[PDB]
Amino acid sequence: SMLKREDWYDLTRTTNWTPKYVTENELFPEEMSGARGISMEAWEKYDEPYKITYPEYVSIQREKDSGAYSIKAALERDGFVDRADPGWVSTMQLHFGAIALEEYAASTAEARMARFAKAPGNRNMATFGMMDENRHGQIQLYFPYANVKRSRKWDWAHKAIHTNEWAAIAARSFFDDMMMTRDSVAVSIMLTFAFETGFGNMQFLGLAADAAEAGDHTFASLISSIQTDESRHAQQGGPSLKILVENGKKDEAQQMVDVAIWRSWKLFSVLTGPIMDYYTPLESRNQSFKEFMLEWIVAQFERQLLDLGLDKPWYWDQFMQDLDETHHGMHLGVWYWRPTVWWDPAAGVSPEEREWLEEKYPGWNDTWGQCWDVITDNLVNGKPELTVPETLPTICNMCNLPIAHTPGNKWNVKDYQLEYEGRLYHFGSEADRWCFQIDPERYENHTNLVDRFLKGEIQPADLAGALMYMSLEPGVMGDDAHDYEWVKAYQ
Amino acid sequence: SMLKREDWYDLTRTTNWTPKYVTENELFPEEMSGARGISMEAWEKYDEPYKITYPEYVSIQREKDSGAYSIKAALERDGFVDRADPGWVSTMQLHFGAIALEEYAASTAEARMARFAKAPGNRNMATFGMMDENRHGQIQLYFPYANVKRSRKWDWAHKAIHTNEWAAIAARSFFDDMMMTRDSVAVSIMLTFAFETGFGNMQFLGLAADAAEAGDHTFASLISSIQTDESRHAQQGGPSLKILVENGKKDEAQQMVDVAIWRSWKLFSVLTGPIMDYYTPLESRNQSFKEFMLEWIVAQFERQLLDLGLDKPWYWDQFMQDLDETHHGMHLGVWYWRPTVWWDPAAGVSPEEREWLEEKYPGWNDTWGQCWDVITDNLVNGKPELTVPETLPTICNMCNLPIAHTPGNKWNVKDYQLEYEGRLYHFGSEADRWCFQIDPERYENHTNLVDRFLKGEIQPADLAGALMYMSLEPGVMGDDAHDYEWVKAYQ
């Protein structure tokens, strides 16, 4: 017969001991552990809500891959990608490029906790988390690999994070800050609590639904399978926060959460917001990016923070307001500077789409709509060259994304500059600048693409040179997803 | 370490022994064994070409179901069936009804060899075959079960073979004769060699391709998975024939093959022929039923027979000729008598389809086309009631299918009657009558639907009574698949 899991589970995490041949601080360097003065005994109160053992893991995870890989093989000769909406294809090329290698990098982030967390339960769950991200990086490489012969753009599923293309820099900027250069406790909070539990979880749920709605069952199965592995390790931050709040650090925990949530939001406003309100076909939009954020992301954060004894970040109201603006700017920016990304941005401004936008965001046409009005006239009148740029946009020194905001009749574009030690920094928001000011030495000498351009690091020092610097060449450089089809409605 | 399969395989089939407490004839009743005077030692020369052991079976078959069931679950909420071509839906309803319970019945046919074959290797392969058909009956019940709430027609996946509906009688007539009421050796020849190796194998290959072409990946995966289990047990007839030919029975083996192939052809001409040339959308037809038969079925039979030292059946030339006629008649019959089947027959006679038919079968329009001309005029002129019958068609006493053939300008419909012991029998072909004459006592007192009608066994003795006798009611009674859409092209 077999024992009940509940009978022996605890022995799997009764692994702490008192070092003798080396000191505790040597075995658990503070810069890697982040125990923050809290004793080993106090950290042993850590209790992961979702428990699992090795044999259950290899068994359940074997079946998950068997199914996901079986579905792929079955739908492979079908070539759905060949007839899929260009907006959907772009969504996937973007997804794989910005995420595949960052997924793999997350296993190192997990390994950080696996070795340096003083909480035994955290160390084991992180070992399974490490395995989870190992799977995510491999499966999200194996799937797009099937499309390499279709377009060089699919090569960016692997190549992207190895380039200095602006979007890739913004990605590494976020991920390196949240999970690769933080102590164990900090990682569990900033990565698994703030980012995975707070954004990634719901996002993959909606992405898998979108895939299905688009008729892409291979991708839908892929994403929903991956998403079921999430809670097993996204759960790690919760108990760490409980321990920090119950001991002396409530403020320290709050600050990490504030930073992580804001930085997550920014990457989300450019990689997800534009997709929901502009790339997804009008008739497939079940709700707006803002509606999605309010129902599935924002409300959850408030319940989570409340249940943890933490407060809503100082920037919460502003964040709410920005749900009406930020992503519209990130979209216009990406589309206008489309040759600089590796996928084809979908304009999404046809007459029908424009009334939807007006419905979801009252005032859109008299603000964002005006820039698009000018762009549309030029396309209608044969001046396409006025729809691409001849200069670089100003880049935020924190999120590494263009500084953009409400245009038109309610012009409200602002730059939160900061002079620090003889250098002028630019920030796209009050919160981005604050992330810099609470920890200047963490970002001080990093240079964004604009900084590099101005320092002479990009040669030739022109647009063609900047494109080469970013490893972009005809074939992968972006253009309008539907090849300006939406222009015909304006003649 | 592990042994190589080749090292111990033979011991798995070194299971024959000399009975002592019972006689050999008692242990292996001739009516069940069919050893036919050939000794136990001579039957031990039986050597299955495709070998497999228990552990390989449960391992490989576990993965096959894991994948097929995973694909189904993944595409379930998609409801492809709801938007599939009506001709395809009909193809599936027909398939499940005529096959699901016959698949399950085949496991008993396999069990017949498993217990009564004197060849050890045949007994073991039949045990795996028994398992294979057990899977086929269950999986082809489990899949259509998903559609029961969509139409009562899906209930026939289970109900059909339990009714006296004419198609169900024709099915049982074939299957009971080939595999349920024959001795072990006869079964291996007539079922696995003639039917499975000769027709079922290729047919499932084409069916799975059709499913994919139709966009039904659930069914495509289902069928191709099932088809991979086929060769493992369809192989059983080959070695039995070798043994019969090498000993005294070459004529006995030839006769069983002649009967089985002709009876298989007839069921095939009504269940598969009509589907390829009329239900499958014009643009999805990669080849005609005749072309399919010549390339994938007929040529293979000739090579198989030649390699076995057997001859081409006496009816071979006629069979070749009939590839131009038979199924067209089976189709017209099923469509004209559509209220009598449980799926919606697709007419398939639109202007475009008619030129395709003329291309694949020169002379179609001046023969089969004329009946359809009359039917079309009546539909165009509002006399739909002249497109359904008021009497039963004459039924062949062997294949239990209507006796039909070339109409129009090359009228050639014939009835191969036979008076036997004070009763007049009707046969749809020279070969069907011959199957009766070489073994009269096997069919003598069986009565086809027409016979039952005329004997007073169907009451009330009218069409409404015949429908009730066949368990058919509004909701499952068939009509035009596209609701007479093709009529609009004629106005």
Binding site: - | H328, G329, L332, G333, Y336, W368, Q370, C371, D373, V374, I375, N378, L386, T387, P389, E390, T391, L392, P393, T394, P402, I403, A404, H405, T406, P407, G408, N409, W411, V413, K414, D415, Q417, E419, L424, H426, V450, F453, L454
Partner: protein
Amino acid sequence: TFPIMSNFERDFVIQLVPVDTEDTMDQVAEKCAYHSINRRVHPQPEKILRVRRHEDGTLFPRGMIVSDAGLRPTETLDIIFMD
């Protein structure tokens, strides 16, 4: 009442058709036509429908009645167009 199998000219299928033992071959052909003419076969006004025994091809006079034709119940008959 007597059953016969109708193999109507130019049609594609043989059908069950109940005739009366007192029916004339003409009346038999009429009962058979009901199931083929204007259903799957065009009328031929310039022709006359004749009844022939399928097995041997024996042509029955128009006026002969079922009762005198020496038919086996369920016997198949060809219904052909003649002058």
